[PDB]
Design a protein around this ligand. Structure first.
Ligand SMILES: *[C@@H]1O[C@H](CO[C@@H]2O[C@@H](C)[C@@H](O)[C@@H](O)[C@@H]2O)[C@@H](O[C@@H]2O[C@H](CO)[C@@H](O[C@@H]3O[C@H](CO[C@H]4O[C@H](CO)[C@@H](O)[C@H](O)[C@@H]4O[C@@H]4O[C@H](CO)[C@@H](O)[C@H](O)[C@H]4NC(C)=O)[C@@H](O)[C@H](O[C@H]4O[C@H](CO)[C@@H](O)[C@H](O)[C@@H]4O[C@@H]4O[C@H](CO)[C@@H](O)[C@H](O)[C@H]4NC(C)=O)[C@@H]3O)[C@H](O)[C@H]2NC(C)=O)[C@H](O)[C@H]1NC(C)=O
Ligand SMILES: *[C@@H]1O[C@H](CO[C@@H]2O[C@@H](C)[C@@H](O)[C@@H](O)[C@@H]2O)[C@@H](O[C@@H]2O[C@H](CO)[C@@H](O[C@@H]3O[C@H](CO[C@H]4O[C@H](CO)[C@@H](O)[C@H](O)[C@@H]4O[C@@H]4O[C@H](CO)[C@@H](O)[C@H](O)[C@H]4NC(C)=O)[C@@H](O)[C@H](O[C@H]4O[C@H](CO)[C@@H](O)[C@H](O)[C@@H]4O[C@@H]4O[C@H](CO)[C@@H](O)[C@H](O)[C@H]4NC(C)=O)[C@@H]3O)[C@H](O)[C@H]2NC(C)=O)[C@H](O)[C@H]1NC(C)=O
Lengths: 208, 209
């Protein structure tokens, strides 16, 4: 029989009013003989009807892939509402259901410190700009880097890591060439989390 | 039938001459019909005989679970020598064999920087010391913090995360009382990795005015 997976919205989507968060429901390993699937979508247990269903698309292993997309309201997602995808296929007796929701737990505000490169690193032609984000709950978060209004490029972020006090931290690392840093250019770490004011904060860092 | 699980040594003990790395081979799901099982260790395809096998200890489901440990040579594990465990029970036609080895790939030596806590943070009870370890391959590594000889309690470490050049990096965060930091206590981040000189390096951090 098939398998079904249910993806949450992109954190930034739910956290920013201008964007548009969606819950996604994809079923894989569907037949060729009876390959027609029926979605049923439920919010806090009451069925809903605005879901957009894509028509099935075959993959290389010749199994189809069918996804349904549900727009959610920001406040509903952040207020804990359960979304439940219920998928029916006639190569299944009992239809299978999955439910997702926002990470449960009491929200805690992240502290955001920017840390300049180690003096020892100034021997290389790349330096590391560090953004420490700690003390946040739940784990759903978004961290970006930018400079003079524009998305900075060479960066990479660690997964959230459970801290000793039950909360979460992460580090994000931006690699820039030494010259830019030494010039005096200003870089900024932008964080997006439900426990921040406006769901958004920014901390800047430049050579002094 | 029965089952077999093969545990690598733990990085730090392959990496320290003075410590003792061991490959362990545990068999579970014994039969009570035939509870006798015998090992044969092959280092890179050659039978080995300095293996130790602790006796047969029965667990609550009524199965037995027995394990052989094999002390390995550091240089052998680190030189990519295959380690094969061949376990036989008359509750299974063909005997069962499993093999593991350290992860393959060109080693790359990490760089180790220590980052003092933000000034923004100095308005707190606890501050954060940061250890950046980047450029290392493969990912098997150990990071530890210490102060005046003894280890440190309050620290966590990120999983290695793949960087854009194919190497790995991570961060270790140590949280200490602002008061200890401000007295001028010195804190060390020590790293163990096979591409380091002597498998070990250390960077220290302490207050600067
Ligand atoms: C035929 O091929 C198709 C097509 O797949 C494609 O083709 C093949 C040949 C290869 O090239 C594939 O690499 C390629 O994807 C096969 O379809 C695939 O089937 C497998 C397994 O059936 C699925 O694996 C699952 O992957 C997802 C995570 O995948 C996301 O991220 C991937 C990044 O690598 C990306 O490739 C995926 O598309 C998907 O991306 C998301 O996309 C959505 C919508 O497009 C988007 O909103 C998001 O932005 C994006 N998200 C991310 C993060 O990128 C995941 O669902 C699965 O993980 C579960 O299962 C694992 C088994 O335990 C486990 O590791 C996980 O923890 C998790 O386990 C479950 O977790 C929770 C609790 O934590 C719980 O609900 C469950 O109980 C628990 N356990 C189980 C058993 O479920 C899994 O890793 C592929 O995603 C899928 N392909 C696509 C495109 O989705 C098909 O299988 C082949 N047919 C056969 C074999 O017959
Ligand atoms: C009856 O009971 C006994 C035990 O008795 C007790 O009584 C009953 C009532 C219950 O309460 C029991 O829970 C209880 O323990 C059962 O014995 C158990 O059997 C199961 C399955 O047969 C084993 O599960 C496997 O676990 C290991 C990983 O285990 C390590 O980590 C655990 C941490 O939670 C820990 O419990 C283990 O002891 C072990 O710890 C290691 O210890 C060594 C030496 O002591 C030490 O060096 C290490 O430091 C330490 N390591 C760690 C990490 O802590 C693992 O082998 C299995 O995972 C495989 O399978 C999963 C499914 O895919 C997958 O998630 C994994 O990735 C992995 O998958 C395999 O991986 C590779 C490829 O990546 C490859 O080899 C395989 O192809 C691949 N796939 C498969 C399918 O294997 C699995 O999770 C228990 O370990 C074992 N108990 C003990 C104590 O070992 C017995 O099963 C019961 N009988 C029944 C149910 O009939």
């Amino acid at each position: 029989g098939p398998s079904v997976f249910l993806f949450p919205p992109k954190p930034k989507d739910t956290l920013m009013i201008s964007r548009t968060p969606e819950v996604t429901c994809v079923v894989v390993d569907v037949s060729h003989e009876d390959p027609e699937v029926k979605f049923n979508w439920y919010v806090d247990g009451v069925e809903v009807h605005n879901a957009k269903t894509k028509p099935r698309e075959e993959q290389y292993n010749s199994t189809y892939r069918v996804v349904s997309v549900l727009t959610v309201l920001h406040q509903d997602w952040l207020n804990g509402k359960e979304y439940k995808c219920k998928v029916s296929n006639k190569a299944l007796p009992a239809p299978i259901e999955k439910t997702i929701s926002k990470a449960k737990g009491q929200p805690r505000e992240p502290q955001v410190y920017t840390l300049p490169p180690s003096r020892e690193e100034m021997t290389k032609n790349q330096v590391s700009l560090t953004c420490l984000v700690k003390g946040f709950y739940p784990s759903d978060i978004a961290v970006e880097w930018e400079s003079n209004g524009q998305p900075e490029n060479n960066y990479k972020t660690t997964p959230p890591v459970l801290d000793s006090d039950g909360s979460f931290f992460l580090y994000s690392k931006l690699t820039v060439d030494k010259s830019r840093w030494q010039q005096g250019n200003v870089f900024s770490c932008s964080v997006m989390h439900e426990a921040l004011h406006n769901h958004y904060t920014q901390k800047s860092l430049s050579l002094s």
